[PDB]
Every structure is written in structure tokens, then in C-alpha cells.
Amino acid sequence: REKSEKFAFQAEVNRMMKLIINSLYKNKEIFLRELISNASDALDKIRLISLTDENALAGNEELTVKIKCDKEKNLLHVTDTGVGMTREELVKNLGTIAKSGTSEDGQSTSELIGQFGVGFYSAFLVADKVIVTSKHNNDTQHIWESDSNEFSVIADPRGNTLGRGTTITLVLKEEASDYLELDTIKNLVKKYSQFINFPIYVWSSKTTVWDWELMN
Amino acid sequence: EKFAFQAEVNRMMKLIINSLYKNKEIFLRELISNASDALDKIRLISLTDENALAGNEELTVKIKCDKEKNLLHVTDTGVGMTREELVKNLGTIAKSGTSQSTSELIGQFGVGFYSAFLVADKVIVTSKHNNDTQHIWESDSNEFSVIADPRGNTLGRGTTITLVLKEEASDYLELDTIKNLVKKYSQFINFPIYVWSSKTGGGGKTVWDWELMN
Numbered sequence: 001r002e003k004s005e006k007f008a009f010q011a012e013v014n015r016m017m018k019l020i021i022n023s024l025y026k027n028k029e030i031f032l033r034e035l036i037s038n039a040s041d042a043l044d045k046i047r048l049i050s051l052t053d054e055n056a057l058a059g060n061e062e063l064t065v066k067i068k069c070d071k072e073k074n075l076l077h078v079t080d081t082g083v084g085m086t087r088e089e090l091v092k093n094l095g096t097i098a099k100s101g102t103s104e105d106g107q108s109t110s111e112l113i114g115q116f117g118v119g120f121y122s123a124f125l126v127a128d129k130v131i132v133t134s135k136h137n138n139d140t141q142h143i144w145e146s147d148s149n150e151f152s153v154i155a156d157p158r159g160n161t162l163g164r165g166t167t168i169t170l171v172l173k174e175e176a177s178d179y180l181e182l183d184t185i186k187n188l189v190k191k192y193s194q195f196i197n198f199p200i201y202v203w204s205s206k207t208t209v210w211d212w213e214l215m216n
Numbered sequence: 217e218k219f220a221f222q223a224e225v226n227r228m229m230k231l232i233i234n235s236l237y238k239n240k241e242i243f244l245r246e247l248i249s250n251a252s253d254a255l256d257k258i259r260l261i262s263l264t265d266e267n268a269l270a271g272n273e274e275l276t277v278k279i280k281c282d283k284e285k286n287l288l289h290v291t292d293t294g295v296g297m298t299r300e301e302l303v304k305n306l307g308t309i310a311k312s313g314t315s316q317s318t319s320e321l322i323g324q325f326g327v328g329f330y331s332a333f334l335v336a337d338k339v340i341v342t343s344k345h346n347n348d349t350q351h352i353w354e355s356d357s358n359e360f361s362v363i364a365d366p367r368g369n370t371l372g373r374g375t376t377i378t379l380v381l382k383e384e385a386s387d388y389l390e391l392d393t394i395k396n397l398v399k400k401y402s403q404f405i406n407f408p409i410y411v412w413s414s415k416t417g418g419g420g421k422t423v424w425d426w427e428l429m430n
């Protein structure tokens with residue numbers, strides 16, 4: 001009975017605070033860095049499952065990140081066609097968020113915090129809720145909402161919208177509405193995506209008509 | 217408006233640590249663990265300089281309540297801090313009246329410091345390091361000021377953290393339940409933790425002294 005994980009948990013927690021406060025000094029932009037990173041990792045994951053499964057690309061064939069802004073509603077959407085998440089994985093989340101109403105193995109909370117805690121809690125720099133909608137092969141499509149502390153989860157009323165992958169929805173604060181100005185978000189996505197092997201798109205406009213625009 | 221960056225560092229630290237620990241009592245776990253670290257630091261130092269513990273030979277943690285004035289004191293005879301360390305503190309508090317190395321400061325001690333503001337409205341650090349004057353440091357997480365102690369070298373070596381508690385948390389001071397949480401969060405520290413409690417030893421007054429808890 002080792003019981004030395006509450007040391008690695010502490011280390012990962014401390015790395016996490018270092019970076020989130022680091023970002024809060026300057027950019028505030030680390031949430032977007034992590035949003036693109038974790039999307040790419042989930043694209044990296046299912047491309048890597050397509051080399052022992054052949055049916056793996058049967059809910060989608062594209063391997064994309066698609067970012068859409070809802071200026072009016074004040075939402076930020078980052079959709080990918082990666083591996084997705086089963087209801088099981090969504091309730092484990094990053095080991096730290098418990099179901100709504102309770103305040104009373106597997107992969108350890110330590111290593112989840114290491115890869116996911118930074119992107120999760122940094123969202124709350126600019127957002128008030130983060131909503132996760134995701135579809136894995138061999139489970140249905142669910143939605144997951146958290147306030148930083150607790151979560152609830154349901155099956156998606158719209159059935160299977162994504163085919164495969166995840167949509168991260170950031171209910172933004174009004175203070176941070178500037179992040180949905182098409183021009184500030186394009187340059188951000190251009191900047192943080194230049195070393196992604198996958199095509200990353202922002203929903204944009206010409207002259208006036210809207211379509212996806214490749215940023216890398 | 218005034219302390220915009222300080223207020224946001226506060227909002228974010230409370231949010232993250234409430235999410236991770238779900239227990240406002242974390243503040244006292246951290247109070248005790250950071251005190252144990254100051255003690256191990258001076259302990260290790262003492263294995264190569266024979267005369268390191270000269271300013272104070274005991275290696276303890278001493279917890280005294282003050283239900284009367286709503287103060288909680290945790291005092292360790294660990295390595296202490298220099299005035300320079302006190303003025304760095306965490307890097308996020310501004311020096312009083314002011315209208316990444318600091319990042320790594322929040323890494324090490326931010327949980328321990330900001331958890332104290334779940335439960336209190338002001339934090340006072342009194343410290344004495346080997347080869348430095350003793351100073352008093354105080355902060356409300358926005359501003360901070362540090363002075364030389366007029367009482368002089370009264371700790372000999374080490375640190376006293378003092379939490380001016382919120383009203384919402386006055387409970388933590390009743391000598392019964394404070395003994396419970398120290399017994400809990402310190403059953404596994406490699407240094408003695410004492411609490412100022414009382415007994416009845418003859419027919420007459422009760423007497424206060426150091427009760428041991430580990």
C-alpha cells in the first residue's frame with residue numbers, strides 16, 4: 001500500500017497553478033492553447049487506433065478541428081473529430097469534479113490533472129461554465145456541464161450530431177466577450193496552431209458569406 | 217478597479233482549490249504541512265553545521281487559539297524566513313500603497329496561502345531566520361507591509377502564522393474541535409505538534425499548557 005500518489009497529485013497541482021497564474025499575468029490565452037492541444041491529442045489518438053481497427057473511421061473520415069464563434073449568444077465552440085468520450089470517461093472527467101449534489105480503481109487523479117487540469121481550470125479565466133459534448137464509438141452521445149466544482153451529465157437530445165469527437169463549449173463571461181471578435185480569434189488560432197499536423201478551421205466571412213477557413 | 221490583478225488571482229485560487237479539495241479545512245492541513253517543511257529544512261541543515269539550532273534548540277509546531285480576539289496561531293521553530301523572502305512572499309500581492317520567478321512562487325505556496333482566505337480575512341507572518349532580524353509581515357491578499365519587530369528576536373528561530381478569521385469560521389477556535397482536526401491532519405508528521413489546551417489537576421482553577429497530539 002504505497003499511498004504516495006498524494007505527492008504526485010501535489011506536484012501536478014503545483015505545475016498547474018504555476019502555468020495558470022503565469023498566463024494570467026500576460027496573455028490569459030493558455031485556455032486556447034490547451035483547447036487546441038487536447039483536441040490534437042484526441043485526433044492523434046484515434047488516428048493511432050485506426051492502425052489496428054479499420055472500422056474506427058466510420059462516424060467521420062475527416063480529421064479536423066473546427067472553431068465557431070456565437071457573438072450574439074457569447075459562446076465559444078471547439079469541435080474535433082477525434083476519439084471522443086464514452087459516458088464512463090465523462091463521469092471520471094479529470095478525477096476532481098464530482099456529481100451535482102454530492103459532497104460526502106482506474107487511471108489516477110494525478111495523471112489526469114497532469115494532462116487535463118490546466119486546460120480545464122484555465123477555461124474559468126474567461127468562462128463561467130464549460131460544456132462538453134462527445135461521442136465515442138460503442139457508446140451514445142452525451143453532454144457534460146461543469147461550474148469548476150460539480151457536474152451533471154445527460155444523453156444528447158439531438159442523438160448523434162458529431163459523428164465522432166468532441167465539442168467544447170465555453171459559456172464566456174461578458175468581460176471576455178472580446179475573445180469572439182473574429183479577428184482576435186483568427187490570429188490566436190493561427191498562432192497556436194502552426195505546429196498541428198491536423199487542419200484547424202475558424203468559421204469566417206468574405207464579400208457576405210460564411211464558410212470554414214484553414215489556419216495552418 | 218483598484219486591485220484588479222489581486223482580485224483575479226484570489227478568484228482563481230479559491231475556485232481551483234475549492235474544486236480540488238471540497239473541504240474548507242484544507243487551510244489547516246497546509247498550515248501544518250508547510251510548518252513540517254520548515255522544520256525538515258532546518259533539521260537537514262543541522263546535520264552538517266553543528267551549531268545551526270543555536271537560536272532555538274527545539275523542533276516543534278505549537279498551535280494556540282484565542283477565541284477571545286478571533287485569532288489562530290501556528291508557530292514552528294523551523295528554518296524561518298529572511299526579510300527578502302518575506303518581501304518576495306508569493307509575488308502576487310502588491311506592496312502597500314501602489315497605484316517567471318513570481319509564477320514559481322505560487323507553485324510552491326499558493327495553495328497554502330490562498331486557502332487561508334477561505335477561512336480568514338487577514339494573515340500575519342512573524343519570522344526569524346538564522347542571520348537576520350525578525351520581521352512582521354501582514355496581508356489581506358491585496359496589499360502587504362513588512363516591518364522590523366519592535367519586540368526584537370523573540371522567536372530565536374522560526375515562524376508564526378496568525379489568521380484573523382472571518383466571522384463565518386469562528387467555530388475553528390473552540391478548543392474541543394480544534395484538537396480534533398489537528399489530531400486528524402497531523403497523525404503522520406515527523407515532528408511534535410502541541411495545542412494550548414486545559415486540564416483540571418486539583419480542586420480549583422484550570423491550567424493551560426502544551427498538550428501533545430501525535
Ligand SMILES: Oc1cc(O)c(Cl)c(CCc2nccn2Cc2ccccc2)c1Cl
Binds near residue numbers: 036039080089093
Ligand atoms: O479540449 C478537448 C478536446 C477533446 O477532443 C477532448 Cl476528448 C477533451 C477531453 C480530454 C479527456 N479525455 C479523457 C478525459 N479528459 C478530460 C476531461 C474529461 C471530461 C471533462 C473534461 C475534461 C478535451 Cl478537454
Ligand SMILES: Oc1cc(O)c(Cl)c(CCc2nccn2Cc2ccccc2)c1Cl
Binds near residue numbers: 294296305341
Ligand atoms: O505556514 C508556513 C510555515 C512556515 O514555517 C513557513 Cl517558512 C511558511 C512560509 C513558506 C515560504 N517560504 C518562502 C516563501 N514562503 C511563502 C510565504 C512567504 C511570506 C509570506 C507568506 C508566504 C509558511 Cl506559509
